[PDB]
Design an enzyme around this catalytic site. Structure first.
Site, mmCIF file in Angstrom:
data_model
loop_
_atom_site.group_PDB
_atom_site.id
_atom_site.type_symbol
_atom_site.label_atom_id
_atom_site.label_comp_id
_atom_site.label_asym_id
_atom_site.label_seq_id
_atom_site.Cartn_x
_atom_site.Cartn_y
_atom_site.Cartn_z
ATOM 1 C CG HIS C 28 -0.284 0.058 2.526
ATOM 2 N ND1 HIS C 28 -0.143 -1.051 3.331
ATOM 3 C CD2 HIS C 28 0.273 1.088 3.203
ATOM 4 C CE1 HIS C 28 0.467 -0.704 4.450
ATOM 5 N NE2 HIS C 28 0.728 0.589 4.398
ATOM 6 C CG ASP C 50 -2.144 -5.765 2.538
ATOM 7 O OD1 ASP C 50 -2.672 -5.994 1.430
ATOM 8 O OD2 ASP C 50 -2.804 -5.635 3.591
ATOM 9 C CB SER C 102 3.863 1.541 6.261
ATOM 10 O OG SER C 102 3.492 0.381 5.542
#
Lengths: 51, 151, 151, 151, 151
Positions: C28, C50, C102
């Protein structure tokens, strides 16, 4: 009649494009001086004549 | 940083400035802006003022230069030193400013920008600057003294 | 270094890491890795986790992070300090984590990667983290709390 | 700087030398030149000499190494140490040369380029180098021992 | 004095010199010689070498500089200082000389004129000069580096 109608449509398109081009260019030239000056009076009449 | 150099082939070909949330750079200067954040902005052309403009990222808007139109006669500051403002004209001593200095800002003693230097006139003892400024109504105007040449 | 921030418009919006000879970046997180050697490899998608992955260049395969599947209950560390691992959940004090963190790996007391953080949930006292980890059998699993938000 | 390294995958795999106001780089060394301006100029191929060449930028025309065709018996130097010239052959101590040293010029006691190194052979006592030099007539001549490995 | 400035509107456009019994000045230098004894001389247009020449008046015959064709590599003197000559090229440090300096003579260690400067090329840290010199047989020739700008 075919030639006449085709000529009229071509004239209309060329004239409308030129008219819109001149009017849009006028708006850009008229409004640009104020976009580069956020703190300006920007009279309401300006938004009515140049837009 | 308030001034960002523009590089064409690795050399500086001008400077880009951010004022009041908007970025300006000389329209006649080719090359990329030496800033990843500013190089990603797609700017609109303003041939009246020989410059391109556009909005800046949200992270920069908080520290942009303040616009001002109060330009009383006197001396003003700029990157290469002081600037003299007389007869509604910005002039500097000979040898101050040249090719590649286009787009530099001129500021008052309050840190507000009054004009953007795009070029000038090379005289015998002084030089006159071709700059974009604002009139008493705050409307953008370009001042190009006779014989001005883009820098 | 071993962690390589991912930059989109000149700003860091995530971090890539190299584990056991593979480069792992969140799926993402859109942008380019702030590198030239690791950014030139084509990355495969792992949408079920992901994550994206690719092969580390031959000259870089030796300079990579080690990982372990043994995660005994206790305290772990990462870029922002200590991380608590209890009740099968990775958690950090409220406000320690947030958007942008992230792809940052979590390290144990031995410097081994134990999980890759992808998001989190703010609980009453601590923020739970959504991470990609390995179960007791060493198989890659996505451990996410209820209502986790991508960072 | 007169000798610039060449990089392919971020590591140096050879050198590009500015000698006589012209760029000399080996053909078997693929990659960009360390200097951005030397990498931006189109170069010509000389397969008979295993080297690639082109005119240097205006600023590099004077800042270049001078070359000499006179190489009497004696000692010369390069970045790996001293170089010994005997029996018309360039020999270096055992193990001194190796992969990545191609393109480095051999300089005399005056700092002039005598030869460009391309490879070598370990003879068990000393190592013979494959070089590009100039004969008694000043004409470019390649001298390589049989079995020499390109470096 | 053996060198006389040439002025068109009161500014110095170049210099004239008396070498071997002849008055020399470049074709591109406009104006009149301050010495009326030389300015009144009708000069021949040697377009082959961009030089005007005439016969020195009997009253000025004593103000003549000796010249020579023996110009070995080394350093030479002129009005701006030392001049370095190597590889059949005349070079001065960048910034030493410019427009208006054409027609100056270059003298050896014995005060003999070896060349007349017409212009030059800025080559990085050094500027190469376009000069009129005599070959190893004493024959007048014009040396012009590519891109040389008349001074």
């Amino acid at each position: 009649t075919i030639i006449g109608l085709c000529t009229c449509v071509a004239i209309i398109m060329v004239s409308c494009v030129t008219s819109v081009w001149l009017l849009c260019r006028t708006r850009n030239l008229c409004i640009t001086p104020y976009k580069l000056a956020p703190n300006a009076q920007v009279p309401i009449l300006l938004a009515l004549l140049c837009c | 940083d308030k001034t960002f150099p523009i590089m064409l082939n690795g050399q500086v070909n001008g400077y880009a400035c951010v004022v009041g949330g908007r970025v300006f750079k000389p329209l006649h200067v080719e090359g990329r802006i030496d800033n990843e954040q500013l190089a990603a902005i797609k700017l609109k052309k303003a041939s009246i003022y020989d410059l391109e403009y556009g909005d800046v990222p949200q992270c920069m808007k908080s520290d942009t230069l303040q616009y001002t139109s109060d330009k009383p006669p006197g001396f003003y500051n700029w990157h290469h030193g002081a600037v003299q403002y007389e007869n509604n004209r910005f002039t500097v001593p000979r040898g101050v400013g040249g090719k590649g200095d286009s787009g530099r800002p001129i500021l008052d003693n309050k840190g507000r920008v009054v004009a953007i230097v795009l070029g000038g006139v090379n005289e015998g003892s002084r030089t006159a600057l071709s700059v974009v400024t604002w009139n008493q109504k705050g409307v953008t105007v370009k001042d190009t003294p006779e014989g001005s040449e883009p820098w």
